[PDB]
Amino acid sequence: ECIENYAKVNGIYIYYKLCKAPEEKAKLMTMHGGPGMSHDYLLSLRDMTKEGITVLFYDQFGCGRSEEPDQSKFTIDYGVEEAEALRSKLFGNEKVFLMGSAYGGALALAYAVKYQDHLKGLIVSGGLSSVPLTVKEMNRLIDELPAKYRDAIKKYGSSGSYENPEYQEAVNYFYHQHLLRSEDWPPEVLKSLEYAERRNVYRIMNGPNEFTITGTIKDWDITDKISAIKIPTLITVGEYDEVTPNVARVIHEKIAGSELHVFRDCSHLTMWEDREGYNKLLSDFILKHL
Numbered sequence: 452e453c454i455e456n457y458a459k460v461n462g463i464y465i466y467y468k469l470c471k472a473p474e475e476k477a478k479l480m481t482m483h484g485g486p487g488m489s490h491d492y493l494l495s496l497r498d499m500t501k502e503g504i505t506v507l508f509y510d511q512f513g514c515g516r517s518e519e520p521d522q523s524k525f526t527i528d529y530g531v532e533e534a535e536a537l538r539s540k541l542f543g544n545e546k547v548f549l550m551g552s553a554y555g556g557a558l559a560l561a562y563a564v565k566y567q568d569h570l571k572g573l574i575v576s577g578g579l580s581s582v583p584l585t586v587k588e589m590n591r592l593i594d595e596l597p598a599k600y601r602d603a604i605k606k607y608g609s610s611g612s613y614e615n616p617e618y619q620e621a622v623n624y625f626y627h628q629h630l631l632r633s634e635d636w637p638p639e640v641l642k643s644l645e646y647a648e649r650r651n652v653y654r655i656m657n658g659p660n661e662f663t664i665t666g667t668i669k670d671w672d673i674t675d676k677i678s679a680i681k682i683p684t685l686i687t688v689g690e691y692d693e694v695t696p697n698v699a700r701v702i703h704e705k706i707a708g709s710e711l712h713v714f715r716d717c718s719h720l721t722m723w724e725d726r727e728g729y730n731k732l733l734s735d736f737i738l739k740h741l
């Protein structure tokens with residue numbers, strides 16, 4: 452059973468779940484996506500504890516069970532400092548591996564750019580170094596959808612009528628094709644989605660949905676900074692990932708020595724679509740860079 456707590460970090464109370472032992476070989480911090488989701492959908496990574504990998508989960512500022520800070524702090528830079536504060540105020544000076552999913556991936560990239568000296572390795576899953584680029588690729592995905600849904604997206608989407616059933620059915624389709632390719636989504640994934648809708652971070656930083664990123668990060672782009680990352684890096688992406696392998700390729704190019712792995716028959720939530728394979732890949736990576 453993991454150890455759960457609700458302590459104050461860089462000024463605000465953050466919820467975290469530390470799943471450690473047995474025979475710990477390394478520690479791994481995880482950064483969920485959204486922005487504005489919760490750690491819940493990453494729980495499948497908990498399996499790695501059986502491989503000697505302690506896993507740290509936590510809900511970022513304003514996310515899930517964590518308290519929301521002042522609006523002025525709704526930035527990726529703030530998320531990075533929040534993350535370093537948690538690592539230090541939990542593992543002291545220990546070197547740790549960092550894993551980020553989607554937005555969590557971009558956040559993990561920003562973190563590495565500044566604090567890679569506190570890391571043994573970096574893992575980015577369905578991540579991005581440029582929101583604009585990700586939008587470009589997502590737009591292509593929308594057009595590749597059957598006219599039926601594609602039209603509803605451009606129609607109600609351009610009218611801000613996200614409360615329409617046709618538009619809604621179009622979003623559901625896109626999700627079942629590029630977010631999670633499953634007819635029965637796990638409770639953990641559903642909980643994080645619910646959390647995003649309940650809090651404000653998702654609406655303020657991201658936007659109405661996965662492919663309608665009109666939040667405060669819409670222009671965020673640090674592709675020209677990531678080349679400064681020199682630590683072991685593992686980049687993963689799903690074949691049908693809403694954050695396409697083309698976006699992943701851009702990250703891979705800049706980080707020398709990094710690895711790029713495309714999960715066939717998978718989309719964005721690769722940790723659920725191929726749980727055993729996803730965990731094995733990360734476990735082998737971590738264990739080979741102690």
Ligand SMILES: CC(C)C[C@H](NC(=O)[C@@H](N)Cc1ccccc1)C(=O)O
Pocket residue numbers: 483484485486488492552553554555577579581582585586643644657661664668694719720
């Ligand atoms: C639906 C939630 C749980 C999934 C999440 N998705 C994201 O992080 C998107 N915000 C990706 C994005 C695109 C462009 C610019 C910023 C972010 C996840 O899988 O973690």
Ligand SMILES: CC(C)C[C@H](NC(=O)[C@@H](N)Cc1ccccc1)C(=O)O
Pocket residue numbers: 613619622623626641644645647648659660661
């Ligand atoms: C899309 C419906 C079923 C809710 C839920 N989606 C979310 O919580 C957002 N991340 C995406 C969203 C899409 C459309 C309308 C509101 C939110 C889900 O997919 O389970």
